[PDB]
Design a protein around this ligand. Structure first.
Ligand SMILES: CCCCCCCCCCCCCC(=O)OC[C@H](COP(=O)(O)OCC(O)COP(=O)(O)OC[C@@H](COC(=O)CCCCCCCCCCCCC)OC(=O)CCCCCCCCCCCCC)OC(=O)CCCCCCCCCCCCC
Ligand SMILES: CCCCCCCCCCCCCC(=O)OC[C@H](COP(=O)(O)OCC(O)COP(=O)(O)OC[C@@H](COC(=O)CCCCCCCCCCCCC)OC(=O)CCCCCCCCCCCCC)OC(=O)CCCCCCCCCCCCC
Ligand code: BCL
Ligand SMILES: CC[C@H]1c2cc3[nH]c4c(c3C)C(=O)[C@H](C(=O)OC)c4c3nc(cc4[nH]c(cc(n2)[C@@H]1C)c(C(C)=O)c4C)[C@@H](C)[C@@H]3CCC(=O)OC/C=C(\C)CCC[C@H](C)CCC[C@H](C)CCCC(C)C
Ligand SMILES: *[C@H]1O[C@H](CO)[C@@H](O[C@@H]2O[C@@H](C)[C@H](O)[C@@H](O)[C@H]2O)[C@H](O)[C@@H]1O[C@H]1O[C@H](C(=O)O)[C@@H](O[C@H]2O[C@H](CO)[C@@H](O)[C@H](O)[C@H]2NC(C)=O)[C@H](OC(C)=O)[C@H]1OC(C)=O
Ligand SMILES: COC(C)(C)C/C=C/C(C)=C/C=C/C(C=O)=C/C=C/C(C)=C/C=C/C=C(C)/C=C/C=C(\C)CC/C=C(C)/C=C/C=C(\C)C(=O)O
Ligand SMILES: COC(C)(C)C/C=C/C(C)=C/C=C/C(C=O)=C/C=C/C(C)=C/C=C/C=C(C)/C=C/C=C(\C)CC/C=C(C)/C=C/C=C(\C)C(=O)O
Ligand SMILES: COC(C)(C)C/C=C/C(C)=C/C=C/C(C=O)=C/C=C/C(C)=C/C=C/C=C(C)/C=C/C=C(\C)CC/C=C(C)/C=C/C=C(\C)C(=O)O
Ligand SMILES: COC(C)(C)C/C=C/C(C)=C/C=C/C(C)=C/C=C/C(C)=C/C=C\C=C(C)\C=C\C=C(C)\C=C\C=C(C)\C=C\CC(C)(C)OC
Ligand SMILES: CCCCCCCCCCCCO[C@@H]1O[C@H](CO)[C@@H](O[C@H]2O[C@H](CO)[C@@H](O)[C@H](O)[C@H]2O)[C@H](O)[C@H]1O
Ligand SMILES: CCCCCCCCCCCCO[C@@H]1O[C@H](CO)[C@@H](O[C@H]2O[C@H](CO)[C@@H](O)[C@H](O)[C@H]2O)[C@H](O)[C@H]1O
Ligand SMILES: CCCCCCCCCCCCO[C@@H]1O[C@H](CO)[C@@H](O[C@H]2O[C@H](CO)[C@@H](O)[C@H](O)[C@H]2O)[C@H](O)[C@H]1O
Ligand SMILES: [Fe+3]
Lengths: 273, 336, 101, 62, 71, 48, 39, 59, 60, 39, 60, 39, 60, 39, 60, 60
């Protein structure tokens, strides 16, 4: 099925790889070559996750836990029942996420859109790749990755934080948190403003960009304007993921002590040492 | 190399700066518009006049006194040393009352200033809500913004009501940059790991989803801004190809889409539910559940790991400690 | 602030719009580029004035006349640079065979 | 005296019923444009059925 | 002196004044209520010769304890 | 404790934050900042 | 804006209300002082 | 130094303050630094209270 | 005195006054209910000679 | 906005409302004082 | 010297001046109230002979 | 804005206002000095 | 020398000066108040010979 | 901005105001040095 | 040498100069105030032989 | 040589140079000040034989 205006947009062309070969739709979905590789990796990864659940102690969704190998295996593939399965699933994940971003690029090219969406998603892929590839590689063992399990990965997050005694004191983490919180505030204001001009109280005329601009300017003192708020929301949301990648990659590979004692440089500035 | 719409090379300026359109009574616009070249390169250029009214003026007076009490207590805590006030600033705190007072008024140095600063801050936040609500009505807009702000205030108020429900002001959040993070960590320790609080988990999902949505929506509108997609009100009232292409991108990508209007409803709810589910999770903590990991064991959240140690029965009696009591109020000699 | 045309490179002292009486290849290149642009900019400004006079909208006629005068003043500034570089080009041995202006 | 049922669990299912209600409402709002769908078997509505297309009152003059 | 009301709008000055006076009044009552000598809600019935004097020490009470019992 | 004995004023911390001994004072050893950690001696004038 | 006549009228009430308020506060301090002197 | 409840619901048995958890946290940072180790040397931080989930070094 | 209602719209002032009185009353009740002497929901039936009194000067 | 006679009519109710409120509050305070004096 | 009011708008200067003095007065009262010698709400009734001084007891 | 003879009139009030304030503060200090000298 | 006031608007300079002197003066007072020797609110009544002095020669 | 006469006039006040302030600060330091010398 | 003021706006230079000297002066004073030897507010009355000296080589 | 001042703006290069020297000089002073050997504010009065020296090679 198609939207009432959709058919004239369903042209050939805009692919990166494969040409006409996969240039077709399946229901709502665009396929393409990277659609085919997406489904391959998604399917292989998901079934290996189900296999991980089957050989683990429970089918309880919250408790399934496919763990990485012991650190002793270093950068090798471990035995599959001893964490090698987590490694194969990680390759499927990297393939699925990369295929998704390239399929987004093919869709955007077909619609004559800018490449903003694929690159914005690249921010999230960077954080995932930091957690399971880059940081474990810098530490010299794949066993530093997080386990695949809805709550067991939260146990990993807890323990990694307390490896540095007081992870709130990590300076890149403070920035990352500030971006996440500021993003959520900005999203609530942008949503509210557009809705409040487009859905005014009954019997009021539809609002305008001028009213939105005036109100916003009483909130922050300055006008952000229409393109400015979308630049800001993109800067905040993607910057949050980039600073997250920074805050975790410096924890271990570069800083090994507790995070509170990193702040010793501030106490010893020569003006007040 | 293709123009990315991230930066504007050519701004234009109007010799007059726009004013406020209507309803000037019980309050008036302060200042007058001016232009910022830097703000005009990030986004729109006019730094404006501003509105307060009665509620806004009172909000600032209450909020100034709150901040003044916080800062003066911080500065008193380093003995008025202005070098240490800057050097140590993020470690400084205005700290809640001692626990044995419960809900009684505490001594002034021992949290009496804290409760006073917290009271004026709370009133200031409510008056600022009233300001925003009145201003939305005066511009003839929907009340979507004050209800979004009410959700944040709801979470904030749980840092009053949960200490009230457990019965002691000592459980309140200290005013201080690192101190309130010390409180945040210690709260999760006391109540047995907040990761297993399911309303905390929901709040995180909505916090992450807010970043997902603003990344997706921000990128989507910039990808069609070459076609006027950023003129969203016009695209909502008079759908152009920019709206059609952004609907088709997401439909062809993930199999379903929003509209140019309704994407802003998704945005609004994901932001609002972050702080609303958060507040509920706080209010349940210490009142209904006292150890969230054990609640997770009961309800089946906790993944099993092989035992790292095993206690003998006499170690189970030896290795129980005491709950923490009062600090020693004397300096013992050991001479006999 | 940075000048429009050398921009970021003005922080490092590259500044080819400055009034130059010696022969300099970099300033000559810049002046040939900026003359062509400013001649076209004057041509546009007087087309704009003619259009607004046809519409008869007095405050717009006033501004279009002010803009044209400003555009002429900027063109004269570049023609002054062109001539003083032309004088130097004739005598400095390494200089271009083609005139600057 | 119910051992398994506790207030945190009761609250959580209260939220789930609201949340699944909210997703339905948002998916109704998402269909005010482009629906009903074209198909070789005639029009299709998806589920839930969409809310009707809005008409917007313009500012009378200015 | 009445020309001060030409220079400032009384309708705005009256709001700022009521704000200042309310915050000042509330500050002083909360300050006194936190003092030993003037915590009148608990000790107002004491005669002037047996209200506390000199209780200026910063840690009049223990900083660290459990919460009061749940009963 | 059954009752509270107030400490000498020179043993009373100016900073009421609970973790500051670990998060700051174990790394900070500036002399003037150290001296400010406790209230100074204070005596009735007729006892000088 | 105001006329000077209007400003003079307002000033009369403003001064009177201010001094009236200060007189009421002076009595409240007389009562407080006789209850529990602070010097 | 204990502050964590050994049950799901709140009870008269534990009335520890969050300030007392801050005090134990201060103490534990001192111990960690004294050995040059982090909290996971003696705890699984999903439950600081747990002995079974913790390494034997906690004993 | 009535001319204050020409300067200030009474439909605003009435709402502001009602809100102020509501919050003030709620604060004072809450302060009293938290106190030892006036926690009337638990101790209201005590006679005045039995109600708590806060300490004293330790004047020997 | 109100006229001056419309304002002066409103002022009569406002004073009466205020007096009524203060009277009720006075009786409440006197009940409370007789139950448990604060001085 | 009144020509300073031609140079500066008195309407802005009085707001700045009153704002400055209020904050300065508040700071000084808070500094004094934090001190031992001048915490007047607890110790105001002490005579000057017995008010605190920032010195240790004699004979060291 | 200000006229010469508007500024001069304003200056007179500012002087007597400042002096009146400084007088009250001086009484306030000498009263505080008699109660508890700081030098 | 007065032509410096043709280079700069004295309305901007005189505000900048008052701002500088006000903050500088506050800083200096609080630097003194927090010292031992000049903690005049607690110890101002001490004579100059009684007032504290920082530590001196390093050895017995 | 200013004329040369206005700059000349303002400069007389500004120099005198500055040196006056410095004279008052000189007496303040004289008093402070008499009370508690810093060298 | 006065041709330098043709090359630069002297009012821009004076602003940049005066701001530089102000910051530099403050930085030096706070460095010295934080030192042991030159903590003049606490120890300025010590004679030059009594004032602190930083640790030497051991030369044991 | 001098034709370099046709290729570059003198007015502009001088600001870049003067800014660079200011930054370089301050960095070198602060690196020395935080050393042991050259902490001249504390130890500048020590003779050259008496000033600190970093730990030597001799070892078991
Ligand atoms: C954690 C907190 C935050 C968590 C945040 C999570 C937010 C999730 C929001 C998005 C969820 C809805 C996605 C969606 O609408 O897809 C379109 C599809 C079809 O409707 P249509 O698009 O309007 O019309 C097209 C269709 O009628 C004809 O299309 P065509 O002929 O071309 O293609 C064939 C058909 C076949 O139909 C299907 O295959 C539908 C299968 C849907 C399974 C997934 C449901 C997930 C529900 C999640 C909410 C919750 C369920 C409990 O159409 C298609 O092929 C459409 C393919 C759509 C693929 C969508 C995949 C989305 C997967 C999301 C997984 C999320 C996991 C969290 O819709 C549906 O089938 C019905 C969805 C109804 C809304 C969910 C409401 C649930 C309320 C509770 C149960 C109510 C019971 C009465
Ligand atoms: C539990 C945590 C609580 C914790 C406590 C949390 C409390 C939070 C309360 C937040 C309430 C927000 C409501 C709101 O914003 O409404 C919009 C309106 C501004 O809009 P406006 O357009 O400018 O308003 C003026 C007017 O044009 C409005 O006309 P409208 O046609 O829209 O109607 C709105 C009115 C309806 O009118 C009335 O209610 C007045 C009727 C008077 C009748 C007098 C009797 C005469 C006849 C005799 C028979 C009469 C028979 C009846 O209604 C409203 O919307 C406001 C209703 C009152 C709000 C009270 C707020 C306090 C609630 C306390 C709740 C405590 C808990 C139970 O502004 C307000 O209402 C202001 C609210 C009051 C704020 C006062 C300032 C607070 C200062 C605190 C200082 C405390 C220390 C001293
Ligand atoms: C060791 C630390 C604990 C922990 C302890 C807590 C605690 C404790 C809390 C949270 C809460 C939250 N945590 Mg958690 N959290 C941990 C780990 C995480 C991780 C992670 C990757 O590990 C993430 C992503 C999160 C994420 C989140 C958020 C979803 C949530 C806060 C929502 C919000 O918007 O707050 C920010 C928004 C606000 C605070 C609202 C403020 C609005 C007011 C009106 C603003 C007033 C400003 C005023 C006008 C001016 C002030 C002036 C100054 C006083 C001077 N936590 C671990 C397990 N977390 C909160 C929650 O809801 O829990 C259920 C909470 O209270
Ligand atoms: C939906 C959840 C998210 C959210 C939403 C949200 N927050 C909001 C809003 C919304 C929708 C607002 O509309 C509101 C706002 O105003 O936004 C600009 C606000 C707001 N969110 C804020 C902060 C904030 N939000 C946060 C979080 C979030 N907000 C969530 C992520 C956080 C975090 C993460 O911790 C913070 C810190 C504020 C910026 C703002 C509310 C401002 C407010 O209430 O201010 C009260 C006033 C004061 C504290 C006093 C300031 C005094 C100044 C020092 C000036 C003094 C001047 C003078 C001396 C006195 C006056 C004199 C008179 C004579 C004039
Ligand atoms: C000084 O006194 C305090 C308050 O008692 C002691 O701290 C106690 O012990 C800590 C475990 C706890 O943190 C704290 O809450 C408090 O309970 C502190 O250790 C010092 O103790 C010595 O003085 C005690 C005292 O209070 O006088 C004394 O206690 C004993 O004597 C008193 C008076 O006769 C009597 O009331 C107590 O019951 C009694 N307590 C006990 C346990 O016997 C301590 O003596 C002993 C044996 O504990 C003193 O301790 C030492 C080593 O000298
Ligand atoms: C920390 O300190 C702590 C512990 C907190 C201690 C300190 C506490 C402190 C500092 C307290 C301060 C209290 C205070 C200070 O001012 C308190 C001031 C209170 C006041 C002013 C109360 C006034 C009440 C007035 C009322 C109710 C009026 C009602 C009017 C009515 C019903 C009539 C409405 C009109 C009608 C019907 C006519 C319509 C006609 C129309 C339209 C027409 O005719 O057209
Ligand atoms: C702990 O201690 C630490 C803090 C550490 C120690 C350090 C402290 C420091 C650094 C202190 C510095 C203090 C200071 C520095 O200068 C203080 C300076 C104070 C000054 C100058 C005060 C001036 C007050 C002036 C007043 C009140 C004027 C009132 C005028 C009135 C009422 C009249 C208004 C006009 C009218 C009515 C006419 C309208 C006519 C019109 C319109 C017409 O005619 O048109
Ligand atoms: C750690 O170290 C620590 C401890 C911090 C220590 C280190 C401290 C340091 C580094 C201090 C540095 C201090 C310093 C510089 O740097 C200090 C420099 C100070 C200076 C320059 C002060 C100047 C004051 C000038 C004044 C007050 C002027 C008053 C003018 C008046 C009254 C008249 C106004 C005009 C009128 C009336 C005419 C209008 C007529 C008009 C319009 C007409 O006629 O038209
Ligand atoms: C001279 O002026 C100076 C220099 C001092 C001005 C400078 C000031 C500075 C530098 C201030 C710095 C402030 C900082 C850094 C503040 C940091 C604040 C942070 C990070 C706060 C974080 C969280 C705080 C929270 C969540 C607090 C919540 C408190 C609440 C909800 C309290 C409510 C209290 C109530 C309602 C009290 C009611 C009164 C009673 C109970 C008695 O009656 C009802
Ligand atoms: C106590 C108050 C605490 C308040 C804390 C406030 C902290 C504010 C810190 C702001 C830091 C900004 O720092 C800036 O971050 C952005 C994040 O996108 C980085 O930018 C980075 O991400 C963007 C995407 O967004 C990429 O396109 C870019 O290539 C990359 O460098 C900038 O390189 C860095 O300069
Ligand atoms: C009146 C509000 C303040 C009450 C304060 C407590 C009682 C003390 C004041 C008792 C006298 C009544 O208050 C007195 O009212 C008269 C008018 O009636 C005011 O008179 C004012 O307004 C009138 C017109 O109405 C003007 O002509 C007059 O020049 C002006 O001063 C006085 O300024 C005030 O002093
Ligand atoms: C508290 C700190 C600040 C205190 C500042 C005051 C210090 C005390 C000495 C003031 C002495 C005034 O002495 C002198 O006054 C006259 C008054 O016309 C000023 O005279 C100035 O104004 C007059 C008239 O407007 C002009 O004609 C003249 O050209 C100009 O110099 C002088 O410039 C000043 O030198
Ligand atoms: Fe948008």
């Amino acid at each position: 099925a198609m939207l009432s205006f959709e058919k004239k947009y369903r042209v050939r062309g805009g692919t990166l790889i494969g040409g006409d070969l996969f240039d077709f739709w399946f229901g709502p979905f665009y396929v393409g070559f990277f659609g085919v590789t997406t489904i391959f990796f998604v399917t292989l990864g998901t079934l290996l996750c189900v296999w991980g659940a089957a050989m683990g102690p429970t089918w309880n969704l919250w408790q399934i836990n496919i763990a990485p190998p012991d650190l002793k295996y270093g950068l090798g593939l471990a035995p599959l029942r001893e964490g090698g399965l987590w490694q194969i699933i990680t390759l499927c994940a990297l393939g699925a996420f990369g295929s998704w971003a390239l399929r987004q690029a093919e869709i955007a090219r077909k619609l004559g859109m800018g490449m903003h969406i694929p690159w914005a998603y690249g921010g999230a892929i960077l954080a995932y790749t930091t957690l399971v590839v880059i940081r474990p590689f810098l530490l010299g063992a794949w066993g530093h990755g997080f386990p695949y399990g809805i709550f067991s990965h939260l146990d990993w997050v807890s323990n990694v934080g307390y490896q540095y005694l007081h992870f709130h004191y990590n300076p890149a983490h403070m920035i990352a948190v500030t971006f996440f919180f500021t993003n959520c505030l900005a999203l609530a204001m942008h949503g509210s403003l557009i809705l409040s001009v487009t859905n005014p109280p009954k019997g009021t005329p539809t609002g305008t960009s001028e009213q939105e601009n005036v109100f916003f300017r009483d909130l922050l003192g300055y006008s952000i304007g229409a393109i400015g708020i979308h630049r800001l929301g993109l800067f905040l949301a993607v910057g949050a993921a980039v600073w997250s990648a920074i805050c975790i990659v410096i924890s271990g590979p570069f800083w090994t002590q507790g995070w509170p004692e990193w702040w010793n440089w501030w106490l010893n500035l020569p003006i007040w040492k | 190399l293709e123009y990315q719409n991230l930066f504007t090379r050519v701004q234009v300026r109007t010799v007059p700066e726009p004013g406020i359109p209507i309803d000037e009574s019980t309050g008036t616009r302060y200042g007058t518009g001016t232009f910022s070249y830097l703000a005009g390169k990030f986004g729109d250029a006019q730094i404006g006049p501003i509105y307060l009214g009665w509620a806004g003026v009172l909000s600032l007076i209450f909020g100034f006194i709150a901040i003044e009490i916080i800062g003066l207590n911080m500065w008193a805590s380093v003995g008025w040393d202005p070098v240490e006030f800057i050097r140590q600033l993020p470690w400084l705190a205005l700290e809640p009352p001692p626990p044995q007072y419960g809900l009684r008024v505490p001594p002034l140095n021992q949290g009496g200033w804290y409760l006073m600063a917290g009271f004026f801050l709370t009133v200031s936040i409510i008056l600022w809500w009233i300001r925003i609500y009145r201003r939305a009505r005066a511009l003839q807009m929907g009340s979507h913004l004050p209800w979004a702000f009410a959700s944040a205030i709801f979470l904030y108020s749980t840092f009053f009501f949960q200490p009230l429900l457990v019965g002691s002001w000592s459980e309140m959040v200290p005013f201080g940059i690192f101190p309130h993070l010390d409180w945040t960590s210690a709260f999760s320790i006391r109540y047995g790991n907040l990761y297993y609080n399911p309303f905390h988990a929901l709040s995180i999902a909505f916090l992450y989803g807010s970043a997902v949505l603003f990344a997706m929506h921000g990128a989507t509108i910039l990808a069609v801004a070459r076609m006027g997609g950023e003129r969203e009100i016009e695209q909502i009232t008079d759908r152009g190809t920019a709206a059609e292409r952004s609907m088709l991108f997401w439909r062809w990508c993930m199999g379903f889409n929003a509209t140019m209007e309704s994407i802003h409803r998704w945005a609004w709810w994901f932001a609002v539910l972050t702080t609303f589910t958060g507040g509920i999770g706080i209010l349940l903590t210490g009142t209904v559940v006292d150890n969230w990991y054990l609640w997770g064991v009961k309800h089946g959240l906790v993944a099993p790991y092989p035992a790292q140690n095993q206690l003998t029965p006499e170690q189970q009696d030896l290795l129980r400690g005491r709950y923490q009591g009062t600090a020693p109020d004397s300096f013992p000699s050991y001479v006999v | 602030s940075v000048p429009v045309n050398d921009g970021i490179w003005a922080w490092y002292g590259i500044d080819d719009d400055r009034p130059m009486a010696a022969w300099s290849r970099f300033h000559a290149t810049r002046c040939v580029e900026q003359l062509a642009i400013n001649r076209a900019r004057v041509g546009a400004a007087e087309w704009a004035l003619a259009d607004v006079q046809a519409r008869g909208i007095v405050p717009c006629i006033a501004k279009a006349a002010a803009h044209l005068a400003r555009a002429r003043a900027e063109l004269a500034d570049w023609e002054a640079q062109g001539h003083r570089l032309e004088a130097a080009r004739k005598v400095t041995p390494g200089a271009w065979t083609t005139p600057v202006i | 005296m119910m051992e398994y049922i506790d207030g945190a669990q009761i609250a959580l299912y209260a939220f789930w019923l609201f949340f699944f209600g909210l997703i339905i409402y948002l998916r109704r709002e998402d269909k005010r444009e482009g629906y009903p769908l074209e198909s070789p078997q005639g029009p299709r509505d998806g589920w839930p059925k969409g809310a009707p297309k809005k008409t917007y009152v313009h500012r009378d003059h200015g | 002196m009445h020309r001060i009301w030409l220079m400032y709008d009384p309708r705005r000055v009256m709001v700022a004044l009521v704000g200042f006076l309310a915050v000042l009044a509330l500050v002083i009552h909360f300050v006194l209520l936190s003092s030993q000598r003037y915590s009148w809600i608990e000790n107002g019935t004491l005669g002037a010769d047996q209200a506390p004097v000199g209780a200026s020490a910063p840690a009049a009470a223990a900083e660290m304890s459990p919460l009061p019992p749940g009963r | 404790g059954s009752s509270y004995q107030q400490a000498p004023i020179t043993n009373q911390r100016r900073m009421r934050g609970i973790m500051i001994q670990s998060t700051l004072w174990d790394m900070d050893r500036k002399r003037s900042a150290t001296r400010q950690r406790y209230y100074p001696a204070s005596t009735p004038a007729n006892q000088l | 804006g105001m006329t000077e006549e209007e400003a003079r009228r307002f000033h009369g009430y403003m001064v009177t209300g201010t001094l009236g308020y200060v007189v009421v506060a002076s009595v409240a301090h007389f009562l407080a002082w006789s209850w529990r002197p602070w010097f | 130094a204990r502050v964590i409840t050994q049950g799901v619901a709140p009870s008269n048995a534990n009335r520890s303050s969050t300030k007392q958890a801050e005090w134990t946290y201060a103490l534990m940072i001192s111990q960690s630094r004294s050995l040059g180790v982090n909290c996971t040397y003696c705890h699984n931080t999903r439950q600081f209270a747990s002995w079974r989930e913790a390494p034997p070094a906690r004993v």
